[PDB]
Amino acid sequence: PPRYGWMNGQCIPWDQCSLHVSTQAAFFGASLFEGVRAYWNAEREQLYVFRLDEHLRRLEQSAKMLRMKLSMPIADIRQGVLELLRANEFRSDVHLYVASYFGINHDPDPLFPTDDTGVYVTGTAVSRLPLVHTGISACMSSWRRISDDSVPPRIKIGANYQNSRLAQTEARVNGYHTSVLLNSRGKVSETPGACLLMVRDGRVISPPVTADILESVTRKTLMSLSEAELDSPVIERDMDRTELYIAEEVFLCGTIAEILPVTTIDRIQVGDGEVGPVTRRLQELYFGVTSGQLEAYKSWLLPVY
Amino acid sequence: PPRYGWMNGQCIPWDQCSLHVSTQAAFFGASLFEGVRAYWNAEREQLYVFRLDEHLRRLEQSAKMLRMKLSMPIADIRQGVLELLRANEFRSDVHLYVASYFGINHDPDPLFPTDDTGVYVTGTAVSRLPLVHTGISACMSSWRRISDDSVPPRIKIGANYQNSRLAQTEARVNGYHTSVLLNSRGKVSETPGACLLMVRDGRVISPPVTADILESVTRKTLMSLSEAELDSPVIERDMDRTELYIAEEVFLCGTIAEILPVTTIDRIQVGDGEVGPVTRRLQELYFGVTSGQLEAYKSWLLPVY
Ligand SMILES: *Cc1c(COP(=O)(O)O)cnc(C)c1O
Ligand SMILES: *Cc1c(COP(=O)(O)O)cnc(C)c1O
């Protein structure tokens, strides 16, 4: 485990990174959060946080819809990420959670938000799953994705993961790495913890932001890279379940997930069942960008030391 | 605030009733819980927990769907409720939360449930809102109720309250005590924290358990009372929004809510705008039962001292 976490402006022993059970955060999962990765480059001896700004922008914007006042400005939270990476002396890849959470209730009504707000940042060392090279199996879920006008999947909040937990538990129980949820219009949305893209007739295709998905930072990154580097704009259109059986390639992306090739869906082979060239190409760009090997994209990276 | 709470088999100072931020409970709101009320009877000097068994039965059954192993048997949790009421020396009405929660992750996948499980019980003194006598205003919500095959409202888990928080925040922002959500079939489901019933053509009517509601203990109680005492079985049928404008009465029920008469919906007067006779009658029965004044129903009550 790591030595420290960071809460409300200071590093503190990991041991005592705690919320009272009566806080809205602990009880309801009412924490708005961002997953952020830092990538270690051995040649150079540097750690690069990836697109922290896009993450912080999304947190601040999501806080509006929740009527949640940030406990401190995002600039200070940026400072926090730095303090935390450094206090733990991480010399490898790191997964971070940066959170703004509701605290103790200020009101007789327990379902109304409070003004008592805090922030914390957690990081743990991680390394790349061999599944990134191998490819994974997915199944279609029996669960339907939560809807925008009910519990918006566009807000990355602790509470919104129940829909994910059910889909993901079922997938694993049935022998798959993950599953694909249809939304209430019967179209492809995403996977419990990652956006889904496919290749058909030479084009990269992904569901639009109205398909009940989170608007992934990694998704947006791949869209830019496909456009700028492969001269292949990603087409955002609704997708059907049965298209995945005929696509040339399918793969998933997100901060934690990185880029995961999907080689079987419900045990049907995607294309010829191998990791596809577009996937590989996008993996090469993405790993290149995040580790700081491609100068053109350097302004996405925050050096830590 | 109360002096103690109860966690994992023991009373401990309220101050240190805490979860680590990395627990599934803290982060996702992955706590299965029951609201339970204890009622103080001044003549007699006794505290009666109401229908604890029905609450414990629902918790254990809900734990199955979540693949959550109870940390201890329900009999021990019953013991816990007693220990806690007594350690705090409560001599008035009490609201309790009894919770089984997921702890630290045992698995690389953060969306898969762990076997590290605990339980806790919280209680605070409360007293009856004057709104029980006055009646409240409701509005129809712009938010739609979460669905069974997405995030089941039948499971009372921390995480499932986001849908409630949004509806309830909006209600209060707009000058109402609460709101009524339609489900995805466009029918009446419930209110953020209470089931809804109405009276039309002399009959008490409530949405069925397939309208995306929690199967309320208070709901079931009122159904028995209406049947046994008023000779008026509650009819369980879908209800439309526009029926509430023409009903003779509307009222809400749940543990925390008790029985709340609803005298306006979207500022339209329900019936003649006064608390209705059926509501009053059901309030009299319900307050009679819970405080231990009606011997016929004594076996619903658990005496504490
Ligand atoms: C966080 C998340 C993703 C990944 O998005 P990023 O912004 O790339 O981290 C995808 N889907 C869901 C459901 C998520 O919560
Ligand atoms: C707990 C709850 C109720 C009330 O049910 P009881 O079993 O009477 O306590 C009603 N609706 C919702 C959404 C709830 O979570």
Side-chain angles (χ1 to χ4, degrees), chain B residues 14 20 40 65 77 82 88 105 141 184 259 267 274 296 304:
Chain B
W14 174 242
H20 196 279
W40 171 253
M65 174 269 333
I77 297 183
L82 293 177
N88 284 310
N105 257 296
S141 191
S184 65
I259 306 184
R267 310 298 167 196
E274 300 284 39
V304 181

Side-chain angles (χ1 to χ4, degrees), chain B residues 138-142 170 179-182 188 241 244-245 265-266:
Chain B
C139 54
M140 303 289 109
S141 191
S142 56
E170 172 169 282
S179 60
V180 181
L181 289 83
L182 297 188
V188 175
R241 174 191 191 150
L244 306 170
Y245 306 123
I265 307 184
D266 306 323

Side-chain angles (χ1 to χ4, degrees), chain A residues 14 17 20-21 142 144 149, chain B residues 14 17 20-21 142 144 146 149:
Chain A
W14 174 242
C17 291
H20 196 279
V21 286
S142 56
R144 289 291 176 107
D149 191 48
Chain B
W14 174 242
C17 291
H20 196 279
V21 286
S142 56
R144 289 291 176 107
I146 203 6
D149 191 48

Side-chain angles (χ1 to χ4, degrees), chain A residues 12 30 41 64 142 144 147 170:
Chain A
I12 60 150
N41 186 309
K64 279 172 83 195
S142 56
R144 289 291 176 107
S147 253
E170 172 169 282

Side-chain angles (χ1 to χ4, degrees), chain A residues 33-37 54-55 58 95 97 145 153 155-157 160-161 164 190-196 212-221 253-258 286, chain B residues 111:
Chain A
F33 78 96
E34 289 291 337
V36 189
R37 234 165 208 276
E54 268 287 324
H55 287 284
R58 180 172 68 192
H95 185 74
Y97 289 89
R145 191 72 174 111
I155 301 322
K156 212 199 232 309
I157 191 177
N160 248 308
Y161 277 85
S164 294
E190 57 184 325
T191 81
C195 281
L196 185 146
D212 294 313
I213 62 170
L214 183 117
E215 303 184 13
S216 162
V217 176
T218 313
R219 183 192 169 265
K220 184 174 168 203
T221 302
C253 65
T255 303
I256 276 264
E258 307 194 288
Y286 185 77
Chain B
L111 291 156

Side-chain angles (χ1 to χ4, degrees), chain B residues 202-217:
Chain B
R203 305 297 305 272
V204 180
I205 295 156
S206 129
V209 301
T210 61
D212 294 313
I213 62 170
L214 183 117
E215 303 184 13
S216 162
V217 176

Side-chain angles (χ1 to χ4, degrees), chain B residues 19 36 86 93 117-118 124 129 158 198 220 225 253 265 288 295:
Chain B
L19 301 163
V36 189
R86 284 168 189 181
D93 304 347
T117 263
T124 68
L129 309 76
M198 68 171 179
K220 184 174 168 203
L225 289 180
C253 65
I265 307 184
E295 212 61 36

Side-chain angles (χ1 to χ4, degrees), chain B residues 17 20 44 49 54 99 203 252 272:
Chain B
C17 291
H20 196 279
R44 256 158 162 4
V49 190
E54 268 287 324
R203 305 297 305 272
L252 304 189
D272 65 342

